[model samples]
Target chain A: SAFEVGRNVAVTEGAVVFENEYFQLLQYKPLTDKVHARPLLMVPPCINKYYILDLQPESSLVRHVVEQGHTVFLVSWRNPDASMAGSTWDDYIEHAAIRAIEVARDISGQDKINVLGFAVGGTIVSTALAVLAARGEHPAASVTLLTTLLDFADTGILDVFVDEGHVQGAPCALLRGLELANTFSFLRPNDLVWNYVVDNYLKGNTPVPFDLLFWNGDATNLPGPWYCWYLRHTYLQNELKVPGKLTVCGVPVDLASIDVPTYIYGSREDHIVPWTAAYASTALLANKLRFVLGASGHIAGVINPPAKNKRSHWTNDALPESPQQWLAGAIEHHGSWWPDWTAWLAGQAGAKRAAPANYGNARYRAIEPAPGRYVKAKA
Target chain B: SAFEVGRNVAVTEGAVVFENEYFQLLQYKPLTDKVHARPLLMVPPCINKYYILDLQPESSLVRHVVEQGHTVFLVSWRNPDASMAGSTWDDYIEHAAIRAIEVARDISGQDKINVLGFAVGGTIVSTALAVLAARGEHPAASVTLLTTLLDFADTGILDVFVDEGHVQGAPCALLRGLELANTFSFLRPNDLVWNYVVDNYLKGNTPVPFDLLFWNGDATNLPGPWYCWYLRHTYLQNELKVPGKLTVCGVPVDLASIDVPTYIYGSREDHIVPWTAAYASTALLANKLRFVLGASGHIAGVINPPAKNKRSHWTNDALPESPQQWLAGAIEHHGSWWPDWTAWLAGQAGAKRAAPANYGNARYRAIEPAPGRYVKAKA
Candidate 1:
């Protein structure tokens, strides 16, 4: 009965250390005496608020990583409106995500930082890394892509909206930035469409107010130019998979150019980004990659906590050309992929150092409390 | 709850009038005084029992069609074992579906018969029709393909399994027919996989015994060659979409040759055979096609009854080159598609005749009771 946003939910202890036109950077207060030397920067999908990684203290992925002795910083993207309609994908890569990464590194006073991305955030972070790599810079110790798709060839049900016909004509063609975001929810009827239909139409009952559900219902908008560019280059042309075919933020958007050690996580049952398509990243990226397949769908699979011990994941040391080959040889591990991820993160993380007693540095002072004003923006 | 198969469920009145090594054909007793001159032959997916169409008297699609003034016959495929290991995709078309179509026509004393297929059976029926068209025989009055995929280019989540690398080696190479079927359920974890997991594992409860769930759980094995051939040609190779590329039942399988008026039904929420991919049938087949987009996933979409009025559908008269184009022009219609389908069937159906009191005539005599012993066969 007490399910209110920022009241009983998304109450993770953190502070907004830096802010910009596009995003706000949140630095979580350290919960330990000593932390991993290289801070961790989390880039969640811009479609929803960043709180999915910090849903609650119990199941929060951010909490688990931070508690594992890693100073964590998350990029909370501004929920866009018509005023920001002129923004492009390059603007997001260079101004928002890249800026947050730099700020997090500077705040932690660490030359190297570990980067993790979820969904579209994976796309943005990976693109940013490629741009950095092109500039003869390697600021990231390692990178992780969670339920991300580099190869759009088999993008599951998302194809219905992204295909050659849909984006080019009528309904989708007429729909601009925020409309595109609204259309995506209808694409997954069971998850977004019918759940609302049953609650509002048939049952005439109020929606079950849960933290995850609240964050899920709290949708966001995409800038017009950014949305169109994404649909044309990534979804339609599929230039990202083919190295040097696309340019973003003054650098060739090539996965092959990224040379950092990478950890890739894909959900076996993800309807949005098919796991096999996600595995395609292993072949595209020139980095030393570890691909893991988690149980359940896009949300449930990635958010699965080891405490529940409900789902299982698959892991293989070999990065075969095909996902099936990898899966065939992969060993099944019971429980969440969080521990495996932490162990991998620890290896990439440098020597331990005393945790900072306060949030941010003197230059970038704490601007606001965590789960900041940017997330509360409405259409 | 009395949800036992063939007891309180799948209890529509019918009699098995013809039998073969591969299938048994059941002819439902007419509910009307007079029946349409042409008989109806339904070919359901061999992976599951035919009981989905005849789940119960109240909800049975077969009963609904029969009550609409047409004599209906359904093909009940055998649950394969090691004995059927040699059966191929060719065997299913030639010995099972095609043979059953011929028998159904002969029994009803009608030269032209209305044929309907659901899921994989839709693939089987369309392939058979193409073969018949090539052989200079025009036996079909009209054709209906329900939630079927003629073009596998965009097979939704199934693409994850049938991609080039998945089928070539490793996991799939070592997996048997039943194993392949088991893997598919996990592909859509939110639907088949998680539902089972929550009921059996997390909740610590036995599966709720319902007719639909029982039929769903009662999955049948595909013959090795049949499974391999289907995967190679349809999903992996994608040769079926192209005309004259493959041969089946002693004829070149060309979708264009099948010129019967078609009522193509696709579910909007189908994660298996995406509605757009299903709509691709319009371009492949050289026929007058009526494309209808229903609500919900694979099973629920087709089985939806007007009485429930739970979901809505979309329809458009114009068949544009792209599904998106057609969809933009489509008008939303509330309730079931059954009445619309029956109205279309009525126009195609010939003059009325006295309903047959017995199961069959001299050529194809009554073989067994409704549903038949083959459906009762367990793994």
Candidate 2:
């Protein structure tokens, strides 16, 4: 049984407010009568479907953010086609995510809106914000990075494939997401890869539909020019953390210059983004920061729900130090860190205002329904 | 003006005696009325066209061989299209080159034929002969390898891109030869790459027409599935040297079991196939072997004409020693090794016999004229 998008999958109420060539801004209908003043624009990972953010009613982060009385706007990336095979990193950051930030600010009637990014989405939005800050324009009031790598020095197992030759040799085409899915599956081979080979082939039994697992099979095509550039600058060279090492969107990228408060989350057992690497981001960003370490793998850790209370997160009040010292003095809290984040976000979110019935404002009218045409297109 | 295929390039007069999905068997019209008793099947590198062997009459290896009173049958490889992108390596060795050997033997009425392979062509022919030996069949009487690496231990500068990750991650698509042209160009940046960048872009100049240089710009597309499989088995694993390690064309590959007198040539300044790595072949082949080192790069060393006598070659009577010690006792000669090779090949060639009037025999008729449509297709 396969999970279908816009059905039982991304059932959360939302409407497409604006779209560019690369991505669409989906503004979720306000859950409460009055929502937080500062709109939190989300940039979910561009790798797969947006359904992961609002996968189902049971463990929907988009729904969870809206329920917490925050106006939510997500950047739904357009799956790359052969026609869009040669897009650049600047196109993704300057035009796609950055444009979403400006649109969210304009529609919400706020000077500066809150920003949240997950996985590579975090990397994308953070780069965009750095570009904005470099130009002396602060588009974001508060920034949140979930299971991301700003400092790619400690990329753990994924370092094996990161080489200048491989990055340079990458074809100016599309890096099919289906091809990358195998690398992640092999990282935890027994359960993710070989278990299916044994149980499915040897035992001959089909598994039931699992939403996150179903969405895991759903892949996207990343523009190769953009991906190769990302690999060279971040993975191979580790230049994003440098003050003026890389210039993106025609401005020098300086993460230290961005003075907004940041909430950083790292999955404890993530092979993709090792917790230590995530902790390194605290030193790179020059602002008020909070670091939280959650349990499980990359996706599993991020999608953990409060109602289930299956996973725990560790939090430390202590400031900048090494990853080891930070974890040593951390306090372990049961279940999801949703309540802790909402409490922290309340400080930066400002006053509450009357919620809108639909998603868009006068200027950017609702173009289509939620989980629109772009999400339906397969890689 | 560019060198045309039939008019000035590959103009040694040959006919396409046999054609398959992967290659076209070109039977060079006999120059002498009495040709060698043993037919010589020349498998040039699949990377480029058959023109490399017979680029022009002034410096043509094909014409040189025909003038030496030998029946030359060259393999003209087809430039792979998107339709042929998924072809396997065995599809090349078993179905293409092996089929070529069978056709040459059948046409010339010879039980065993002389064999010659240049660059990657050497790797393919040697593997086919090994497969033939494993099946209790001997298709080749003598083997000649020019600038080939049987032992991939010392691949010089190419080792950077030859990793398990790179090979595994290679798209199951066409590895365009035009794309690969850069890697070789960079290996000798001053002469091959940067010189052009400086002279052409910096100084702004137009260079004169050079025969081999014109053909050097001629690139071919290699099937990605084939290239990756070859990389994994040969470059990454170095399994071809190990008997029964890899199965190709449904048979165990045992290069050592290939019992025949072999001629090996390596270039002194060859970065692609280092002379030391080429000398390593003496220890691997089962029977009598003679190695000669020429003074030039990979292409220049192999394509040197005896008439010019500009470049020199090193020869030693010594056997079963290291590359250094072999070179220490070696004597240098001022000319191409083509004459030296013909003297050795004459022994295995038996006696001269009357040549055929046309290119092909009754059964396998000539499909088209030499330098057929396949060679004209671009990457």
Candidate 3:
């Protein structure tokens, strides 16, 4: 009734061309491609605050990938601190999602590019495509995953901390010093800690309300020896589901020797990453995978696309075998699986030319609109 | 992390001590109980922005019933307009909730007064106890509803008027042209009209954290002939569930003939008002009823009371003849059914004495430091 605190601000006034030390890239160009090759970047999650995927402009999603003519690049992340305590997990998949997919494939000279990740930047772009397929470094050609998190042990009411003494001690040392060692790490613990112990410590109610007090004014301190070795190697020794049992740059990765050509999405009321561990971790990818299971949750199922009656997802042609028998035969539709994931990612993007005239060095053009300001940051 | 937009304004240089055009019956006095005889009034709902039940002093539910002594007086309403065009529904239940319960029982020369109502101010205090029990006026000894709404056809998926054929062309001469319906007439048309026509008209974008655009930038206009005769007579003619068809003043009413001693709640993920229609409208009130059910919904289930393990509510003194047989045998609990509904409405509010010095005015005295201007009003 009273302390309704507020914020939604999206003033364009010169649409911010580019800024750095983390991110600012906002150039909605493509009203009819002018030589652009392949751009599409997007990413987002670090715990809510990426304009819920361009919350406007027909619920944007980067103006529906620049109204289907490609060329987009979003990434805004920057709210983490204590000097990003040496941003780990391999500098968020090799120094920030493979340095923004090698600067959007050298800013669109285009050999390959298309990233897009919503929730926890869809496991930091599937651990940056398993750190660029363990450093052979081909980089992205196509990867979408919206309601993110590939596998965190089949999600469902988030097991409530699956087994092993259901998260022990000081709430598992304040959730492994806030680094979150897997299991969808602290997925909205009651909108992040009992609604902030009832709105700012038992409501003595102060002046809090800067974008829900800076998206629940997070702290971001986890560098304490990599938050105790990422909660004893990826959530109490689950060790990222064992294959090579944790290495990253030391090589040895696996999830069934990452083949690529993927595109996942999940949400069927995902309490937090549960579309059957996002289609059993993209059906442990061997190749041609394309999952979907949307309908509002885990951030409105990746800012859904299709339109109107709005609910979504589908898949039956093949790939089921797991994620608990594909959530016991999943099926629930209504609207926007974004036109069947842009017609199965435009038959795996390779046409629609003209628009690249720069990414390399317009250095700064203009237009100044469509949710510019790194998806409206507010901290 | 920059789009930060915070706010905090608390003005109340006090003066209008009890003014009234539509509302304003403040009265906070109580340094020591004078001859004040049992009085309490609260009234909340107008769909949020009423200072969350007087929030400030450590979770203020009217400062814990004015530090547990009674003689409280809230009301506040006054936000609507189009010059409030011929205000009807019997001028908001007989001139605004029975003229604020006869000005808090004629300025506390009390006879009897106790009434609380949170959501939709418990359907405007059950249409002001069916217009004070059809003028026989007495009853109101006790009634705490919080997560209220009497029936609305057992509201399941939180019924935001299912099959919204756009309220069937609703233009009954725009309620004698008293037109006022906008401020999202009452949310939920796919979350306020197609999520703002897909975020501000096909995604052109113009709303991002501005206190949800100043609490959706001050929206108030519900006059179209009292919202088309209260949505065609109580939501498409459920005519407050039959009985004497309907009449507030000329008597004829019947929620089991308004017995008193009642206290109900409901929430278990309430999308809008379906904690089993607040426990089957607490079995249409036939006296001593006590239904609960919380765990968040309908404004976090009446500003939830307890925390930690969270999830809560359950009661089985066996009153299941409806609401799907009390959700096929309730059972599930955790915290804050608001101290078992304030120890069962403090045993029908029979004891407690001391804090009531002036609900109307014992020559207005106790005013120190408690000047929280109706929790910062914009109305």
Candidate 1: stretches off by over 4 Å: A1-379, B156-210
Tens-digit lDDT track of model 3 for B1-379? 3211112311111222453446565655553353235666777665434455643344456655544555567666665545666566667666667887787667666566778887677777777776677667774677788777666553432244332332105644446434322222354442456645644653355434333333333443444555566666554444565556777645766765667877887777776666765776765677788777777655555665453445566665667434444443455556767778766766665665555423335553333323333323442
Q: Lowest-scoring 10 consecutive residues by lDDT in candidate 3 chain B?
A: B3-12
DockQ of 1: 0.02
Which one wins on TM-score? 2
- Candidate 2 lDDT over residue span B1-379, tens digit each: 5679888888888789888888899888888889889989999887666687887788789999899999999888888877776787888988887998999999988889999998888999999999888899998999999888788885432221111110013332334221232123322211221222222321222221255445655766666567566655675457788888878888998888888999999888776777898888898888888998887766667777787767788999887568899988999998888788889999889898888888779998888888777888887
For model 2 the local lDDT of residue B204 reads 24
DockQ of each: 0.02, 0.03, 0.01
lDDT of 2 by residue, A207-276 (tens): 2224544565566665656756665567645889999989888999999888889999988867667789
Looking at model 1 chain A, report the run of 10 residues with the lowest lDDT sum: A163-172
lDDT of the candidates, in the order given:
0.76, 0.76, 0.57
Candidate 2, residue B140: lDDT:
91
TM-score preference between candidates 1 and 2, better one: 2
TM-score of each: 0.52, 0.57, 0.33
